[PDB]
Amino acid sequence: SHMHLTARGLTLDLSRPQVMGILNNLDQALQHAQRMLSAGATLIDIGGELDRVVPVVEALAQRFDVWLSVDTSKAAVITESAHAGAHLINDIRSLQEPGALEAAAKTGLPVCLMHMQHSPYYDDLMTDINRFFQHHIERCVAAGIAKNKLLLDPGFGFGKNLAHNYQLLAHLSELHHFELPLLVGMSRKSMVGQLLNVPPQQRVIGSVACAVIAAMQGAQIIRVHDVKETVEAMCIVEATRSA
Amino acid sequence: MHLTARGLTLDLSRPQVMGILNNLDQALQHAQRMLSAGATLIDIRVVPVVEALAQRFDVWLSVDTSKAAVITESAHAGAHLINDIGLPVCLMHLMTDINRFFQHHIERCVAAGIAKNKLLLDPGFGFGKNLAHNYQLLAHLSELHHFELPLLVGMSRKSMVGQLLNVPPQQRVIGSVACAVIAAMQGAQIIRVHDVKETVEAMCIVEATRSA
DSSP: OEEEEEEEEEEEOOOEEEEEEEEEOOHHHHHHHHHHHHHHHHHHEEEOHHHHHHHHHHHHHHHHSSSEEEOOOOOHHHHHHHHOOEEEEEETTTSSSHHHHHHHHHHHHOOOEEOOOOOOOOHHHHHHHHHHHHHHHHHHHHHHOGGGGGGOOOOOOOOOOOOHHHHHHHHGGGGGGSOOOBBEOOTHHHHHHHHOOOOGGGOOOHHHHHHHHHHTEEEEEEEEOOOOHHHHHHHHHHHTOOO | OOOETEEEEOOOOOOOOEOOOOOOHHHHHHHHHHHHTTEEEOOOHHHHHHHHHHHOOSSSEEEEEHHHHHHHHHHHHHHHHHEEEOOOOEEEOOHHHHHHHHHHHHHHHHHTTTOOOTTTEEHHHHHHHHHHHHHHHHGGGGGGGGOOOOOOOTTTTTTTHHHHHTTTGGGHHHHHHHHHHHHEEEEEEEESSSHHHHHHHHHHHHHHHHHO
């Protein structure tokens, strides 16, 4: 592909699967970030709010060359994080909070929209996901955020039971029809843990096998705890797909 | 699909993990490890292991050999599968060439009293193949399903992982697992590995994806 994102004068090449590392004391964070970079992550996702999140963005921005992603729903945090050097806004609530869509538009930053839905239930999961994204992509565009700024995250684990998460992983290539990059996060989740019955630090192998499946279907960005293992797996996936 | 030997049925609807087991106490203890890890086959001087294992466990016993006497004595010991590079047998071994080697050797077996349903196909990963030959075989692994016979794949800690990642063999667990996932997503039924526990965990993610 020529799929890519643009932020802060930089290009992120999504021609091959990129690993996003998860970052959740200040100095421990920066040592963890450096380790994820050396392991080969090209993005670091910072999760919280303003006083926890913003300084680590500032700190990361000063010291590293790597894309910074901030997961927030708060208009304030979106705004400040932009000033601090964030490249990407990842919102679980798809900019539905008051002022969130406006603040995001203003920044000009790429925005990740995430599907989410009490026991979860769908008449047809893929139909609902599509309808949800068609709707919210229109809402972003109407707000001035260009279609080329958007990423879609089908939200594994979010209002989805075990059978749903695996159905969505089996049909994941279907979301390419939007012509936008897919970001997926399955790392150490219950969808792995409920199948293996192990604690989270023992879900590394299952999480990597989910990452491999998703990458084989063209997912552009993989968000994970265990960067170095997921990077090595993605080299195996890249070599098969180039054969 | 299923296989059958010595009163036991091996179900190939879902990927099965085959243990590699190539001092008697050590083997028996290593095997108990694999069985607890979730291997449903153990692939194995050799004969007293087949015998102890026959007694200890109900798991499928494979043996990697090319002598008629060690074949028949294993077969006597309680062996289920014969793997060579009246039990079921596994053939071993660019796509079109893959097919021909296999076209030929089904003939020999068919003409010589071994049923076609009794055969397995191992495409021979890393045997007379380079970096590109191994990866093109993985990419197009789907093709060989047409012959309608079960697939045995064995890429665990091979060079094809070593060379891409530049990693000593103990450090090839991640990449072998990733190769095991890509093969099993294309329907390979049996995965021959050193790393049983990790491969078994990965085959559960695959079965659940394929089931959905």
